[PDB]
Design a protein around this nucleic acid. Structure first.
Lengths: 81, 119, 60, 155, 50, 135
RNA sequence: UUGACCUCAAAUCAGGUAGGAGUACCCGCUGAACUUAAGCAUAUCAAUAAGCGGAGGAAAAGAAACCAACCGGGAUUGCCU
RNA sequence: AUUGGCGAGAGACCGAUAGCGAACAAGUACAGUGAUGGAAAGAUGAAAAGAACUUUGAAAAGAGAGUGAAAAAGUACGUG
RNA sequence: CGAAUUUGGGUAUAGGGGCGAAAGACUAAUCGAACCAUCUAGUAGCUGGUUCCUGCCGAAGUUUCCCUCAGGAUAGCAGAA
RNA sequence: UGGAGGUCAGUGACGAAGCCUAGACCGUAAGGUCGGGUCGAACGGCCUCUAGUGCAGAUCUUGGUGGUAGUAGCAAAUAUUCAAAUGAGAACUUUGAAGACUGAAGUGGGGAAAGGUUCCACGUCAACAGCAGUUGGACGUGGGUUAGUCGAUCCUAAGAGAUGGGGAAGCUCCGUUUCAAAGGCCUGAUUUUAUGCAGGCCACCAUCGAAAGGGAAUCCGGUUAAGAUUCCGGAACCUGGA
RNA sequence: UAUCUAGCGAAACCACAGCCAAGGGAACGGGCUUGGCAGAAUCAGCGGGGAAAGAAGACCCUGUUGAGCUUGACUCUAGUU
RNA sequence: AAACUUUCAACAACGGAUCUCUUGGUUCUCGCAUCGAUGAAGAACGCAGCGAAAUGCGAUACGUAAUGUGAAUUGCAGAAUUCCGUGAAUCAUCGAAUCUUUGAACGCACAUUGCGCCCCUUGGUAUUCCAGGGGGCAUGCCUGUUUGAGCGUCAUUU
């Protein structure tokens, strides 16, 4: 049986959590994340994957630094009190 | 409402360090009480007071380092300006306003004149 | 029994208990609880009483 | 332009006892296996989606525009046409109604209202004021909340 | 498994503390439409698959 | 030449595109030389390059580069133009002499396809321009 | 017994810089096929989609190794034609 | 030039199966090993005044009573 | 049923590719070329459907050409002005 | 039919729009108008403008709902019975008593992968356990995992993979010691002078890769609701430090 | 087991439905025509009919629709010489 | 005759159509130019008196500082004359900071919260061992510094 009896045999994760994105997409044997391309320098992205680009892009996170850049520009990148 | 930064800023290093230590002791005792008591909102202002003391200490240290590096070039990176990466890489006002001597002579001799026409 | 900073090790727990409660600790055994926090069992020497020090801290 | 097409739906084909419309693939959503891409489908693209290069402005010959303007001006001097248009000029001595340049030089809204009352356009004013009503549809939440009549045109 | 790694154990702890019903007072807050925890998880129903 | 970097032979393509061997790269050997040099010395800006030698296997070029961050270039306005961000990787964008030659950026009737840019010209003359009052 | 030059190295040497993100528009490379031809191979789609490299507030182009054949215009870029 | 970013003004546009996939803790919940796929879900009332109290029931609840302009608005709530 | 044995884990081989004691077998219930997204709303002389009322007029399955024979152009038949 | 320009100084919280009504009138009809119920904030006539403008079908789409139908069915794995307790309620919970079964390649006691708190204690019907439920791996609230000696960590295996170099327009590919100038432990230096120096040996030729391979070392007794080769008592061992 | 009871409780199918003979009819009717006839509600079986259900026949043909494979097909191509 | 079946109405029933609504979309227009090795975008884990999310934030953790305003916040509860005031606030503004583990991600690794190495301090009668506190150690390239290498080569040598 290629169905249920063979499904009984799947207990070895081919993917684990990825350091760069916590997506369970890090292929263990290939040592590459199938989602972000880790450990390559460039995050994996394709122009046929517009939904994927939406999921992984600027503004989908906290923007811990980039959120204040517009305010600082609007103020002229001032310094002082 | 906790301590106030304007009255913290006059205090010295030893006094601020002692205040931080006793604030930490009070916070620890308050965590102990919070374990036994349902609502302990005083822990809120105790944590706030610890933060105020820490920021006053840090501001004093950073001002001291700024005074130590005053005047001389090569200030520490955390102390020098932050504007943006590109704003830091851009040519300074002096460097951008630099012109060659040929163009300097040309600009002196033939500037854009102020003229009007009426009749 | 203590809740301990996750980044602390037995050396730091020993030193911090000594410096906070002025007691001599015999052994430190740590674990990471299923809620993700460090739990330390600090056994003191026979010179000190855990119930004495617990009443000093404030919890009976 | 991408509304109704943000999907990877493929037709299941024949032999599965369902219509041949493209269907969303996958599972465990409720959106999976559902019809997509079509005007008949819920969430599908509309038929012939509206485009911005539709003709919006319409060209009219300058001479025809001026012809219509002259006809409208000449209709302003026909007493019966103004009544049919519904302008409450039954208490005006005669039309065309010509007033002095003191009205051109008038300054305050109260004295403009006084000029209108003294001349005979105040009934038209009251018609405009009392005809204000809420619009009769979805135009209220498109910045067109109220509708009223047109009053006099001071030239 | 029993012989876990710290990353997996940390994910376990995060999921365990997340898995709790909505507090009773958030319901009473004004302009509040949240009536229950929609992101609730049971270990039999839905696997985290990490 | 630039051999087409795909066997498997499985293009399912037309015989017009079936060719592999006698295809020619559209940028010059000079252009790829200075691109490699700029990638190596990414902190500099490729000012120019020239031919020095060649054999059957190799062509040899020398690339002139300028440091945009050295103060000897940041001052002295004769060459501080290259310190502006618009000149980042001129070799990569085809703004060097070889780059402009390969892009076809020249005046005249012989360059009607490539004066302001091949793709810019194509976009301009394949756009459908519609006015409010249709002409 | 010494001092230089040339080239090539080393250093947690002094100070810097590059990478990544985003990519609507911009500058290039690479590059199809569905499709049309009522078949189809050149052609078309299309010097397009996908892929790759690189910028800015715009980019690119830009002061003729131009257009012309006229009584000659006169960098570039856009619109109408 | 500008289907991105920041700020602003509009519409003979759509009006919760519409309009962006998402008016809501929406790229969320869940499905896949993975690339990826990807919903459903708005409306009490002006104000909770969200039904004290009495009775039957083990209890849910019912029947009275009560608030309310309306309970032919009772949270499983605008007409339904 | 003591071995061309059975099996865990690790590891290698990736799609016109792999792997095959060879069945076009197996390659995540998918295999005579996997899955995912995109090109793509691919094309379809072919099937299906094509949403209010009343009034007046009212056909053709024939001619010629067509890789033409389930299609079209052309003439005819019909409407309207 | 949805919107738009004019007008009816049109209708309306003294009830608009919607909806229900084998009530009425009008029109050949599309349909329009009104009576009576429901209700709760907007809507219509006319002259024009405009279109995402009219459904019975498309194995149409999305939701909702039927007859079938209280029907098929809930029949594998030998099997349950008596009393008491608890309880509103017991075929199913608990405790006794009996009858049995697995029968030591078990229906026993542990583990690996996987799961992730299901472990353990305390409270009852909403759901779930295709009957029930007072029971539960369910619900709510809490508690629980203690190491020098057990594992990981260290080593290398098949293999993966930086560097030096060479390809490739490039994302990147090869290569793993190759056409490379490829590093680390003892006393002298160890204070008018530093880790600078004729102080010595030299030449692994990154790294990753096993919770079943190799490997330094812990046992007994007791203890918890739930942990123990980990806690306690006793008794040992290994590694590193003048 | 079926069966009856307590509890629990689906699905496939479904234009409308459900008695025949002949006739004619798209040449094998549940309906139409002419006859036979014709009495609520139903239970267990059953497999004659519903040209029963399951699937836009996989055979066959057509389409200027493919794909796998082969070759002295047409046109090319990697390698090699 | 009932039951049953059909049709209609009334009332009551899952259903959520219609109507009205709308802090949402979608198109058009105008203005502007500002990410990152001074560590970005993204990820993980945590932080509230009582809370897990595109709330906010980082062990100074629903935030600190500075500034403005001027009495709140609010579901419940609270340190407090916080109220004619250097002063409430889930306020606004925002120029000072903090900014955990990461990430181009930088000591080497990383399916490990794994291994080093270098300075200074403290503790263990210690420059070597162990531990704690602090600060560091990536690659390519540029300019300069210092130390070098090569009969590649220049001025002295029986």
């Amino acid at each position: 049986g290629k169905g249920t009896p063979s499904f009984g045999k799947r207990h070895n994760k081919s993917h684990t959590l990825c350091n760069r994105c916590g997506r369970r997409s890090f292929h263990v044997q290939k040592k590459t994340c199938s989602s972000c391309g880790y450990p390559a320098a460039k995050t994996r992205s394709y122009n046929w994957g517009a939904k994927a680009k939406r999921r992984h892009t600027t503004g989908t996170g906290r923007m811990r630094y980039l959120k204040h850049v517009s305010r600082r520009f609007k103020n002229g990148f001032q310094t002082g009190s | 409402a906790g301590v106030k930064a304007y009255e913290l800023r006059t205090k010295s290093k030893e006094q601020l360090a002692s205040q931080l230590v006793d604030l930490k002791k009070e916070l620890a005792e308050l965590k102990v009480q919070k374990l036994s008591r349902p609502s302990l909102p005083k822990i809120k202002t105790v944590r706030k007071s610890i933060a105020c003391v820490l920021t006053v200490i840090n501001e004093q240290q950073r001002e001291a380092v700024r005074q130590l590096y005053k005047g001389k070039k090569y200030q520490p990176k955390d102390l020098r300006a932050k504007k943006t990466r590109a704003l830091r890489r851009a040519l300074t006002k002096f460097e951008a306003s630099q012109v060659t001597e040929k163009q300097r002579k040309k600009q002196i001799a033939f500037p854009q004149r102020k003229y009007a026409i009426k009749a | 029994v203590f809740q301990v900073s996750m980044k602390a090790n037995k050396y730091q727990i020993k030193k911090a208990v000594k410096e906070l409660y002025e007691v001599d600790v015999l052994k430190v055994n740590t674990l990471v609880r299923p809620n993700g926090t460090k739990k330390a069992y600090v056994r003191l020497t026979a010179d000190y009483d855990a119930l004495d020090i617990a009443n000093r801290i404030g919890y009976i | 332009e991408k509304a109704g097409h943000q999907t990877s739906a493929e037709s299941w084909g024949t032999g599965r006892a369902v219509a041949r419309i493209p269907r969303v693939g996958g599972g465990g959503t409720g959106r999976s296996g559902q019809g997509a891409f079509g005007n008949m489908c819920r969430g599908g693209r509309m038929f012939a989606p509206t485009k911005t290069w539709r003709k919006w402005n319409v060209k009219v010959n300058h001479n025809e525009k001026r012809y219509a303007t002259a006809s409208a001006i000449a209709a302003t001097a026909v007493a019966s046409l103004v009544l049919a248009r519904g302008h409450r000029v039954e208490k005006i001595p005669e039309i065309p109604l010509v007033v002095s340049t003191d009205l051109e030089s008038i300054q305050k809204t109260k004295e403009a209202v006084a000029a209108l009352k003294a001349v005979g356009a105040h009934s038209d004013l009251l018609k405009v004021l009392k005809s204000k009503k809420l619009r009769a549809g979805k135009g209220k939440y498109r910045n067109r909340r109220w509708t009223q009549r047109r009053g006099p045109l001071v030239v | 498994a029993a012989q876990k790694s710290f990353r997996i154990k940390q994910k376990m702890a995060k999921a365990k503390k997340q898995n709790r019903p909505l507090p009773q007072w958030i319901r009473l807050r004004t302009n509040n439409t949240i009536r229950y925890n929609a992101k609730r998880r049971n270990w039999r129903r839905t696997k985290m698959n990490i | 030449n630039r051999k087409r970097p795909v066997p498997k032979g499985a293009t399912y393509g037309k015989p017009t595109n079936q060719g592999v061997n006698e295809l020619k790269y559209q940028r010059s050997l000079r252009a790829t030389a200075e691109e490699r040099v700029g990638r190596r010395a990414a902190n500099l800006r490729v000012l120019n390059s020239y031919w020095v030698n060649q054999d059957s296997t190799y062509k040899y070029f020398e690339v002139i580069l300028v440091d945009p961050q050295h103060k000897a270039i940041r001052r002295d306005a004769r060459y501080n133009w290259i310190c502006d961000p618009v000149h980042k990787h001129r070799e990569a964008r085809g703004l060097t002499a070889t780059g402009k030659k390969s892009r076809g950026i020249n005046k005249g009737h012989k360059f009607n396809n490539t004066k302001a840019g091949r793709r810019k010209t194509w976009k301009r003359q394949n756009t459908l321009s519609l006015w409010r009052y249709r002409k």
